[PDB]
Amino acid sequence: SSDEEFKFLATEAKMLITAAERLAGTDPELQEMVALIKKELEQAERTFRNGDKSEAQRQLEFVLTAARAVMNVAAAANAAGTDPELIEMVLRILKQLKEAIRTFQNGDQEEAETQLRFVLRAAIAVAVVAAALVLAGTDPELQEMVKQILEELKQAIETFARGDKEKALTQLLFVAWAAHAVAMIAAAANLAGTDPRLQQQVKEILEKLKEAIETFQKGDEEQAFRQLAEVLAEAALVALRAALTN
Amino acid sequence: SSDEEFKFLATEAKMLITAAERLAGTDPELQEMVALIKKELEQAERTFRNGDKSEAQRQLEFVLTAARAVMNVAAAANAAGTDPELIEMVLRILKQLKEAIRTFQNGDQEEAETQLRFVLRAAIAVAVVAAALVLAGTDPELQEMVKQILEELKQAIETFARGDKEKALTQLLFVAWAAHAVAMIAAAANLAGTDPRLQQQVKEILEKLKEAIETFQKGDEEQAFRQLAEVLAEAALVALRAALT
Numbered sequence: 001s002s003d004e005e006f007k008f009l010a011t012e013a014k015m016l017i018t019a020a021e022r023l024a025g026t027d028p029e030l031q032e033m034v035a036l037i038k039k040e041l042e043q044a045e046r047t048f049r050n051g052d053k054s055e056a057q058r059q060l061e062f063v064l065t066a067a068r069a070v071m072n073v074a075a076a077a078n079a080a081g082t083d084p085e086l087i088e089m090v091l092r093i094l095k096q097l098k099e100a101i102r103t104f105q106n107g108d109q110e111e112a113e114t115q116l117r118f119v120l121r122a123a124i125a126v127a128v129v130a131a132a133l134v135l136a137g138t139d140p141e142l143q144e145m146v147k148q149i150l151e152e153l154k155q156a157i158e159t160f161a162r163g164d165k166e167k168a169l170t171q172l173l174f175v176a177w178a179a180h181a182v183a184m185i186a187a188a189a190n191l192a193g194t195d196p197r198l199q200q201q202v203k204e205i206l207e208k209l210k211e212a213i214e215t216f217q218k219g220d221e222e223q224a225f226r227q228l229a230e231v232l233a234e235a236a237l238v239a240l241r242a243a244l245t246n
Numbered sequence: 247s248s249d250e251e252f253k254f255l256a257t258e259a260k261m262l263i264t265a266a267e268r269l270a271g272t273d274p275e276l277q278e279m280v281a282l283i284k285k286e287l288e289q290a291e292r293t294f295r296n297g298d299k300s301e302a303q304r305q306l307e308f309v310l311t312a313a314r315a316v317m318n319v320a321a322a323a324n325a326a327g328t329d330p331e332l333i334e335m336v337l338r339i340l341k342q343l344k345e346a347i348r349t350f351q352n353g354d355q356e357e358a359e360t361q362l363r364f365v366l367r368a369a370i371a372v373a374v375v376a377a378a379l380v381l382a383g384t385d386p387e388l389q390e391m392v393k394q395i396l397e398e399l400k401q402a403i404e405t406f407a408r409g410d411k412e413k414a415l416t417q418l419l420f421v422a423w424a425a426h427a428v429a430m431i432a433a434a435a436n437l438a439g440t441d442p443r444l445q446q447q448v449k450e451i452l453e454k455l456k457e458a459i460e461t462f463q464k465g466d467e468e469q470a471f472r473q474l475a476e477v478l479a480e481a482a483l484v485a486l487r488a489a490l491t
Contacts, residue, residue, distance in 0.1 A: 004412050012419055017476035023482070079486055134489050158247045167317055173258055190489075191436070222257075228263040233268035240325050243380045246436060 001057055006048055016067035019179045023074035030074050031092060036101060037066045065116050069097055071224050072123040077129035085150055086133070089126050092157055093119060118160055121172050127152055130180040132240035134202035141206065142186050148213065149178050174216055177228050181209055188245050191242035198242045205234045247364060249302040256305045256479050259287055262313035269320035276320050279340060282347060285311045306360060308350055315343055315366045318373040325376040331380065331396050335372050338403050339365060362416060364406055367422055374425040381432035388432050394459060394485060395424050420462055427455050430481035437488035444488050451480050 017038050024030035032207045040063045047056035073093055080086035104112035129149055136142035153175045160168035185206055191200035209231045216224035262489035263284050270276035287309045293302035319340055328330035343365050352467050375395055377402045382388035406414035438444035455477045461470035 008412075008415060008419070010377075011467075015423065015471055015475040018472055019479040022476060022479035079485065099256070131486075134486065166254075169250075169254055170257070173254065177261065225261055225359055226264060227258050229264035230268065232261075233265040236269065236321060237324070240380060243436075246383055 001054055003053070005128065006053070006057050006060060007056070008063065009064055010041070010045065010054050012058065015065045016064070018053045020067065020071040022216065023071060023078060025074075025078070027074075027077060028075060029091075030070070031096060033070050033098065034074070036198040037063060037070055038100070040105075055089065059104075062109070062113060062116065065113075065120050066097065066101060069093075069116065069120045069123040072120075072127040073097070074131045076123070076127040079127070079134050080246065081134075083130075083133065085147065086120065086126065089150065089153065089157075090186070092154075093122050093126060096157070096161075099124070103192050111191050114165070118165070118169060118172060121176055122153065122157060123181045125172070125176045127185045128176075129153070132166070132179065132183035132186045135190050137157045137190065139186075139189060140201070141184070142189060145206065145209065146186070147211075149175060149182055152178070152213070170221070174225065174228060177232055178213065178220050181228065181232040184232070184239045185209065188242045191239065191246060193242075193245075197243060198238065199246070201238050201241075205231060205238055206236070247303055247341045249299070250302045252294055252299065252306060252469065254258070255289060255303070255310050256287070258307065259310045260312045262310070262317045266313065266317040267275060269317065269324050271324060273320070274325060275337070275340060276316070276338065279316050279344065280320070283309060284315055284342075286347065286351075287313070291329045292461075304355065305350075308355070308362065311362045311366050312343065312347060313367040315339075315408075318366075318369040319343070321362060322369070322373040322376040325409075326379050329376075331393065332372065332376050333398060335399060335403070339368050339372060343369070360411075362374075364411070364418060367418055367475065368403065370416070371422045374422075375399070376430050377427040378425065378432045381429065381436050385432075385435060387449070388428070388443045391428050391431075391452060391456065394444065395421060397430060398424070398459070416464075416467065420459075420471065420474060422468075423478055424455065424459060427474065427478045427481045429456065430478075431444065434481065434485035434488045435450070435483060438489075438491070441491060442486070444484075444491065447484050448488070451477065451484055 017034060022033045024034050040059065040088055044056045044059040047059065058106045073090055077090050078084070080090060096115065099111045100115035100119055103115065129146055133143060133146045136146055152171065156171040156175055159171060161192055185202060189199065189202045192202060212224055213225035215227055248269045263280060266280045270280055273285055286305065290306040290309055293305065319336060322332065323336045326336060342361065346358050346361035350363060375392055379392045382392060398417060402414045402417040402421055405417065431448060435448045436444065438448055458470055458473035458477055461473055
């Protein structure tokens with residue numbers, strides 16, 4: 001569609017791969033996925049130099065989203081440490097990413113792009129959840145919430161594999177925001193320290209997040225999504241307040 | 247065009263509007279921009295009920311990108327405080343978002359969508375730098391680095407305004423990853439605390455990022471982008487190490 005956009009896409013794609021290669025470390029599964037996506041990047045470059053440029057761009061745009069996914073998965077695998085629940089989720093997201101790449105190579109591009117839209121959001125959510133658990137430290141209330149978000153992401157991935165992609169997409173949207181909220185609450189509690197004023201505001205916002213999850217599980221989706229958007233804003237503000245004290 | 251996709255985009259777009267309203271506070275310029283995007287959202291919902299559902303989704307997909315940009319701008323202005331450099335970039339990005347919305351309303355949808363590609367990424371960048379400045383505290387090296395990122399972002403906005411959209415997008419891409427790098431390094435410096443061994447690693451990684459920016463300013467973009475990509479991974483790894491102590 002444009003030579004200028006191709007070079008721009010190729011530059012960021014190599015950047016995601018370079019970071020993914022480093023974050024993958026010694027894990028053979030992460031290294032295999034990065035090399036697989038890297039070979040798809042170089043295949044799109046040969047097609048741009050030789051054959052169809054508009055087709056090479058569509059392959060590059062797919063490669064870009066796969067590179068960002070594998071980089072978040074690799075970052076999630078590092079922060080996950082030895083937690084089996086997080087490690088298990090990294091494996092499920094990796095397998096679905098590999099299947100989507102095969103589906104794109106096979107020619108079913110619409111299905112593969114539909115799959116990666118779900119895979120990319122799940123990869124970012126598990127990275128944010130993994131960082132939240134690390135930031136939570138030894139706080140039991142924070143670890144319980146992070147574990148509660150993890151199982152919700154597990155149900156969304158399983159619902160997607162069952163066939164109901166629409167319901168799984170709605171659940172993954174809720175999981176993605178609840179993950180971003182708990183990561184800021186955990187960062188707030190870390191930055192608060194021994195300050196009793198900020199540590200009290202963290203518990204209150206943490207209670208509002210649990211209520212938003214309970215609203216989603218009950219059935220009121222419209223009210224649950226509104227409650228979560230409010231919790232995320234408050235979590236960012238309390239994290240800003242705590243960081244200003246340091 | 248799909249009904250389930252439209253309902254999905256509308257739910258997410260309302261989430262961004264809701265969060266942007268709280269982050270904007272009493273800012274009259276921010277709340278006005280949120281209200282304009284919110285009215286475009288409701289306009290897309292009315293078209294979905296009474297007219298072309300395919301055109302309503304195309305409008306809603308533009309609204310979603312605009313709503314995510316105004317949320318990051320509100321978060322940036324909230325975290326920026328009275329910082330004049332960050333304030334200056336906030337209204338410049340806010341101004342560009344306004345023109346792109348009026349462009350979409352005039353019928354030129356392709357030019358408006360190309361504008362939001364620059365505006366959204368710039369809005370996320372200025373929000374990350376603003377969070378990096380707060381995490382920096384009084385650290386002069388982290389403050390100087392944050393200012394260096396903001397200068398590159400200023401050049402990218404001005405180059406985009408002067409016509410060369412290609413060069414501006416390349417610099418804005420560098421600005422975005424460098425912004426994410428300084429935020430993780432500043433978070434690592436905060437999480438390290440009084441650990442001299444960890445602060446040396448944070449200090450050295452900050453220097454590797456400074457060298458990456460100098461390679462970009464020298465003209466060698468290819469090597470500068472690889473260096474920035476390597477620094478970003480190292481910044482994420484040192485913040486994890488600092489958090490585990």
